[PDB]
Design a protein around this ligand. Sequence first.
Ligand SMILES: *[C@@H]1O[C@H](CO)[C@@H](O)[C@H](O)[C@H]1NC(C)=O
Lengths: 38, 49
Amino acid sequence: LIGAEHVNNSYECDIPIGAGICASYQTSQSIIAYTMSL
Amino acid sequence: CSNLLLQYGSFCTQLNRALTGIAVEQDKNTQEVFAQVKQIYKTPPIKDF
Ligand SMILES: *[C@@H]1O[C@H](CO)[C@@H](O)[C@H](O)[C@H]1NC(C)=O
């Protein structure tokens, strides 16, 4: 995945990517990738 | 082969959703069976039940 910055903190995700990682638009504001929160 | 696929690209095109539809279905299947509660409950440290 390119163009998305990975972040260690976990939130609830809306756009499934796979293998335990989603993506979301979170604060400017840019697109980020993170492990979802159960 | 690709120059002859423009007559069967549509057949190549519908099999993609038939594969995408099942792929998103199995992803939704796990959500419908395991994701019932939104709150994760930790087991108590006391094992005396
Ligand atoms: C997230 O926090 C952990 C805490 O140990 C740290 O090791 C890790 O490098 C952090 N990740 C990022 C992307 O800053």
